[PDB]
Amino acid sequence: QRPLTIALVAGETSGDILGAGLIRALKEHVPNARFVGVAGPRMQAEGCEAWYEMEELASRRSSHIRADLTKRFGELKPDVFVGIDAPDFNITLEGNLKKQGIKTIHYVSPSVWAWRQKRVFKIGRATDLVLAFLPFEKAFYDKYNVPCRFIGHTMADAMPLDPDKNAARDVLGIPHDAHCLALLPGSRGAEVEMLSADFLKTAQLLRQTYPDLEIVVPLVNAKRREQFERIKAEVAPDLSVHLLDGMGREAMVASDAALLASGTAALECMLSKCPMVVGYRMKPFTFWLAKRLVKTDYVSLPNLLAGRELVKELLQEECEPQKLAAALLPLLANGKTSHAMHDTFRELHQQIRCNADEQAAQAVLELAQ
Amino acid sequence: QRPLTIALVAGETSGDILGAGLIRALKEHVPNARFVGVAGPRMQAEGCEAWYEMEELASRRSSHIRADLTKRFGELKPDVFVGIDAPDFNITLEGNLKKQGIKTIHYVSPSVWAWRQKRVFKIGRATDLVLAFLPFEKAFYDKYNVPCRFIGHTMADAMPLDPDKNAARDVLGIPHDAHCLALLPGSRGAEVEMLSADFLKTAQLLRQTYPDLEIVVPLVNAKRREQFERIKAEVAPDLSVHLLDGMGREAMVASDAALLASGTAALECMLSKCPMVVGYRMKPFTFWLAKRLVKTDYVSLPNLLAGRELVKELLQEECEPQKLAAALLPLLANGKTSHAMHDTFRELHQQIRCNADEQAAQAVLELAQ
Structure with a gap:
């Protein structure tokens, strides 16, 4: 009996524009459809009920809103939730709503946001479908078996x-x-x-x-x-x-x-x-560091020398005080974990301690004669 | 008859330290050896004749010095030239000296400098041997058949x-x-x-x-x-x-x-x-852009859509006015080159023009029912 009910979240002007165009095209097929969520002025003009203003998202306040929307969309049980871009807000929300059995779409490939493989897996877990503007974006998600529709x-x-x-x-x-x-x-x-x-x-x-x-x-x-x-x-x-x-x-x-x-x-x-x-x-140092990470999954020399995650690397969103503190506590304890790392550090130190001045001197002599 | 003659170029304090250690170790084997080039205070203390001070390199002035050294080392014909780090100065100089038949070593893997494959090939062409501190640096050059000695x-x-x-x-x-x-x-x-x-x-x-x-x-x-x-x-x-x-x-x-x-x-x-x-x-945008370049060799969307270098990309050291101007002149001529690019732009435009609002609307409807 209930008419089509669509939940939408936009987080910036560009998303408001997408949301308004989406609402108009949907109303052509379902004139009685209902739209609700986080709406900018264009979405509101097309009829979207603005539980929150898009401006609010364009952070403690953002966290509370996502919590409220998680509960309220959970009660509403919309036919579809569409996260319009704003991945740092919507991907988590889409995951929250998916947990409750709600069908979710993420609109716009979150290329900057998806900086490593784990984030790709997260998009797939959070969504039933991703809408991608460009063909190579869909080809990318195809490789991961993540449903993605190329829409132009x-x-x-x-x-x-x-x-x-x-x-x-x-x-x-x-x-x-x-x-x-x-x-x-x-x-x-x-x-x-x-x-x-x-x-x-x-x-x-x-x-x-x-x-x-x-x-x-x-x-x-x-x-x-x-x-x-x-x-x-x-x-x-x-x-x-x-x-x-x-x-x-x-x-x-x-x-x-x-x-x-x-x-x-x-x-x-x-x-x-x-x-x-x-x-x-771009800064060569910044590019070199990124390239090293892309090519090796590491940034620190100890892990490159060891061929594994010998030392904990917390990068990008994981470089966060609670995670940093949790990684340091076992080491401050100065217990056996520290002694094991100490011992490995000693072996690697030996592996690169070879009297470099003398080796360079001999390379010169070998080349000269 | 001539005693061993070694040319050295250091460009910062760390290179001066390396150069001094190298000189000392060499003098142990060849006490009468002669050292000359661009020397810091430590190298000079070990006896390096300072044609120029390392401080000068630590740019029009830098270009003139490299030109003078190119000629003077060319006349001197040293038994070995060792470029100590400072790759933006020494790699080119090593290439200049190699052209004249002089044996060259580059000391310290120029990891930041060698940001793309072409730069690896350049190091190999400029050097007879690279001295690398770390084993994975040598493993890298081994893949390119570039002689590299791991010295610790x-x-x-x-x-x-x-x-x-x-x-x-x-x-x-x-x-x-x-x-x-x-x-x-x-x-x-x-x-x-x-x-x-x-x-x-x-x-x-x-x-x-x-x-x-x-x-x-x-x-x-x-x-x-x-x-x-x-x-x-x-x-x-x-x-x-x-x-x-x-x-x-x-x-x-x-x-x-x-x-x-x-x-x-x-x-x-x-x-x-x-x-x-x-x-x-690091800035997510900066990391995303670097990763895209590493993974695709491109940064611009037209080349990603075309699968080739449709538009000229001049990046890092190539983003330079003379090269930029040379790339733009054929396009400003508004001749047939511009019309060919125009035509390809039109085909790609058609490939991504598909009424996206309507496609998104239909994806929603397909998911909802």
């Missing part, structure tokens, strides 16, 4: 196959006869700081071939804009460019080429049909 | 197998009857900022079991010390700890357990025979 990317629905370059130039005031370069130094402060100078210097070089080159710089917010302008004042104060408040899509559609920091903004540039070069840089 | 770690020569815990406590003023915890929040500012609060909170938890726990915090320099104290004032102003200027080795030898940010300081802790827990955290 919403931005590809929103952007036409053949954008109007001259129309975008008219919006931005770019002459139609000129070559035009888009510089997108990045949405994150780290990206802007690393790459702004190099991108400006690139534009200076291009001006030597294209002295009338138009340079458009979409800047996502005031902070990043203030950051870019400060760098520019130091690096290329006399380079004339169009600083834009947002309008990245217009800038890309308008331009003849784009220089991008972000391999993810590259998608929108692709949909804009703007040829692009991706230039990105 | 110098720190393992410098530190005894059985350190004196009570002696280290006497230096630091730690009571012998007390449990003692070492907190090493990290030598880098990023590490200190991420982990100091969590490590302090861990110590607070441990105090509830060990109310007399001694807490020693080796801080590598004033900046990092000022950074830690500022964090402490906000997180645990009433937690009493021993702030140390350096003295990490003493703190580890003295302690019953150590909480470490650095998987590399973990080696020194191992040699100190101090049981340890490694707690480390």
Whole structure:
């Protein structure tokens, strides 16, 4: 008898947009359907009962809300719960609801969140289905036997196959006869700081071939804009460019080429049909450490020397005081666990104690003669 | 007739120490040997002629020096050139000297520097032999058929197998009857900022079991010390700890357990025979991006969707204005190269344009009934 009842949780504007589009498409098939949960203004406009505002999630408060929703959705027993992105909140909640027999969907591949294999297994345990924008995301979950549906990317629905370059130039005031370069130094402060100078210097070089080159710089917010302008004042104060408040899509559609920091903004540039070069840089040390972890599952030299988890490594979300304290207590006891580790440390010390100066000296002598 | 002539380049204090030890061990076999190159104060004390000071390398100036050394070592034709660490300077120089028939050794595995396969091939082309401190470093180069000699770690020569815990406590003023915890929040500012609060909170938890726990915090320099104290004032102003200027080795030898940010300081802790827990955290986004690069060789979504280098990606040292400009010029020309990329962009756009809202709506309906 009860009409279709769908629970939804969005945690940011992008999720509110997805949720609103989902509600509209569902109402086309089930006009009497009921929607409830954590809703932004767009979802509420389509009729979603807002037990909580999406703004609240966009933390002690977040934990209490998830606890309340766990109980309330448990009583409601919705036909489906859809966690819209926000994986740090929704994956756990989906697991809580799954435990109670409720059917769950996670919308949007949680790529950043799923940083190791254990997190993949957790998504599979928490969900009945994952909705992925891109085909290689589904191919990934297929390898883990995690039900995943490739649904296409919403931005590809929103952007036409053949954008109007001259129309975008008219919006931005770019002459139609000129070559035009888009510089997108990045949405994150780290990206802007690393790459702004190099991108400006690139534009200076291009001006030597294209002295009338138009340079458009979409800047996502005031902070990043203030950051870019400060760098520019130091690096290329006399380079004339169009600083834009947002309008990245217009800038890309308008331009003849784009220089991008972000391999993810590259998608929108692709949909804009703007040829692009991706230039990105991260701290070499940070990259080396990540690569070592990906390739060996360890970060510490003792475990690499031992070929096993000799010392406890608590990384990312596990680097947390309660877990750290629990790992240290057995060692502070200065008991037999410490003596066993002590003994292994001694054997490994012997394995790399070989009078290195003398070995290097002999390598030199062997090579010289 | 000419006595053994060895060219050396060190670029930091640690390299000067290695160079001095190498010179001493060589003089034991060849007392008349001659040493020349880029030398720190320790190498000079052992007799190394300092064409340039190591301080100069510790950049236009660096480029000129490498050019001068390339010519001068080319005229000198030393029996062996040894690049001591400093790979961003020495690998290229070793390649320059190799081109002239000079025998070259690189001392110390350039793990951070060798961030991709192409850089491994470059080390092999630049060197006749690599000297590696650790066995797994040699196993790595073995896979690439790059001559590498495992020589042991110098720190393992410098530190005894059985350190004196009570002696280290006497230096630091730690009571012998007390449990003692070492907190090493990290030598880098990023590490200190991420982990100091969590490590302090861990110590607070441990105090509830060990109310007399001694807490020693080796801080590598004033900046990092000022950074830690500022964090402490906000997180645990009433937690009493021993702030140390350096003295990490003493703190580890003295302690019953150590909480470490650095998987590399973990080696020194191992040699100190101090049981340890490694707690480390890096930006999830940064880790995700690195992992994607390691696993796919790409960072941008267009190349992941295309399964090839459809768009040019210039990363790390290649993200450089001249290369960026050269990659963009063919695209700004708005010629047939741009039209070919445009056409591929259109096909990929079609492949992910599938009315996602409607697909999500149908997935919900399929699951609900």
